[model samples]
Target: QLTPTFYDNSCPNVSNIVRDTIVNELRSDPRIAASILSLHFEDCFVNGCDASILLDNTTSFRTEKDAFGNANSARGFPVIDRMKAAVESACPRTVSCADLLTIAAQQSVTLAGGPSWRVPLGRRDSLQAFLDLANANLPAPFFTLPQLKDSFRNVGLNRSSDLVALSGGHTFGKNQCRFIMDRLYNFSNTGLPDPTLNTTYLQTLRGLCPLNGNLSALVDFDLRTPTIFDNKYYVNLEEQKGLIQSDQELFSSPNATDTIPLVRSFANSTQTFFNAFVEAMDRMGNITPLTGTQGQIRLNCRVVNS
Candidate 1:
């Protein structure tokens, strides 16, 4: 029950305001787009895209941001707060934080040079965050192909194509060294780097993250073109240069037959990847939204209306 024109008369300039805020933020933080994309993905995967991830810890429940996958990883909440503030200035309580997050995500993709499509809107914000579901539902950096697919299915994104296309967002973004340390040193408890990792790439990563190096050190997800949003993530998988275990598993897993073909198709043509990615994003943005009068339009994204 979402539509592209959900705010046609009420907040006609909502998308523009969100886009402009992101554009300004990008000047100082080039990683903003990927961060926003990651944030939105995290939001959608837990109890639907109801902006639950935006809520802070309350007396009744813990915040999703404290969940394992998001604790030190999630970013761009401030960016969403900025967008919400701007949207509220123009349209008051008419525009929900959930819809702002959805729009901000779409605009982030387009602004990062990815495909743009009409984002179905009218989502409302959740009053509570699901901390346990956040830890259980959000896909991990070390998920196997089967585990990855299962995680997607848990959110109603059952198609293999959806999994492959959405993973392409890894074409940008940063991966903390801690997330891949096991893959670089003791993959599968083998005391060796992941065999799926290109030997040369492994050497480079090893040099970047020594045995006693800072675990918080960051590395680009897409080794070659880390900032641009494109199909290079699939190319990285093909070249055995995927940054994490979950990333390499798409093509390197023995049972990757379901995912390999889509990876190749995406690596072969950015256009194909873009088409699928946009479609998948649309599907993700629509996951069980709290629409009509289901949830409140929070004045502050970090807390429910006072």
Candidate 2:
């Protein structure tokens, strides 16, 4: 007769394996390279590299949506699923989906064009469901700078690092028009300007997100540097060209004024950004960890077990 077996639950060692695979595979795969890097920046900047940022209350595994609601980060799941399937084939019912999710996130950072850092593992699944917490904990798409900083600080992140580094994610992706239209047409009311968008581009935006029709448009944030993970985000900020209110608020805010230089420096040197990124990531990995009896080891990525 076969007996049920569970893997030893240790966060540090488990995180190491997850981080290693992510970094290694990132160097080889181009399709997911940018996404993985964005994940790293978002995870560290928002909540100290904690997976808490990824939890969504409204959606299940069968219909999960990422922070952007575009199903892009979902790309990271297949890698972990395959890895988990492989481990289960040999170990059977031993590994937890929570652990795999954490690892996959860590790996995603490196794949996106960011540096790798130590990720402490052994995070058990939360027995608590993902409901009210989703509305309460996750950042909103139109958050103001103060609100964004408070969200990060609530999760124990340094405000300056969180704002600057998180903005770096724009280096690799596109933003939906619905998310930033207020910045364009409703400028005075929103306290935001259109950043002198190119006349032709502005017309294109009008076509995509009509001023009086359906409010939907898609715009590339780092239009100048689309593939590299660098500091162009800061340069855009300086020019009043940031895509969202949360991004522009970083420079406009009195409390976070000091981060302006840090963002400039990051734009100048990848090494400097990487150094700060690693430190931020390490701190992020330590936030509100679920271990011991806090959370459960869910077999499926969607539901929690009682």
Candidate 3:
């Protein structure tokens, strides 16, 4: 089993290197924190946090970077590579990329004003990428409430509470217009905005993302406190200001009976949200990791050992 002290005997400075690297990256790119968090999520969901999502394409297998959910999104690889390189310099052939990612994700959350938790380590790097599974497993921004739950459920995140809390990660990241385009125009192919989006918020988003505008334009998920990691995501959902269809569905979907209460609860208490979020993140990171010599500890995060 993975433990917080997994590297105590081998790579004790692992956490320090990760934190220092993140702080340096944050100076010029405040958004890098959220990008790393998203990278961890995509990696875990596809093949259980083995750092499978970090692999580059080889003659033997395709990379998950080209998946539908990750093609234009899922950034922060260079950040991870940077962190991994530093760790390798210090410890060399010791810490796994998978564990480094988990640690960095936690540090990023704390750096962004969110709660902190002791990340379980010892996860090994995956030997191959799972392009098909990444496309199939990762939840899309346009997913319905039921669809979101089903996707999480298939991966051991069974409770509605876990689904709602983890969705709060959207509180900090900037989403591309292409992902939210359907909600702004032609929602469900209706040729109109999704009624679930707040009228004022929808207008704001439309101005930022005209139907014919640049799809690459970025919009913060929580316009209220775009960079802070807080409970404002649930608050946005309550006000119908959620930037993505899947996020709003947590509160607006008729089948959201179970999820709505949790949303409101998190909106009401930041502490409660943080507590649940920590637990949910712990659950997410623990998903089917390779251990006990099952997978190699990659020398370079981008490639398997030669």
User: For every model shown, what is its TM-score relative to the native structure?
Assistant: 0.98, 0.71, 0.98
TM-score ranking of the models: 1, 3, 2
Cα lDDT, model 2, residue 131: 28
For candidate 2, list the clashing residue pairs, or say none.
11-121, 11-122, 33-111, 33-112, 36-108, 36-112, 37-112, 48-284, 125-296, 177-217
Candidate 1, backbone clash total: 0
Q: How accurate is candidate 1 locally (lDDT)?
A: 0.91
lDDT of 1 by residue, 217-267 (tens): 999999978988899899899999999988989999987998999999999
**Candidate 2 deviant stretches above 4 angstroms:** 1-80, 90-95, 188-208, 212-217
lDDT, residue 16, candidate 2: 46
Cα RMSD (Å) between model 1 and the true structure?
0.8
| Deviation from native of the Cα of residue 235 in model 3, angstroms | 0.6
Scored by lDDT, the top model is 3
Error of 3 at 286 (Å): 0.6
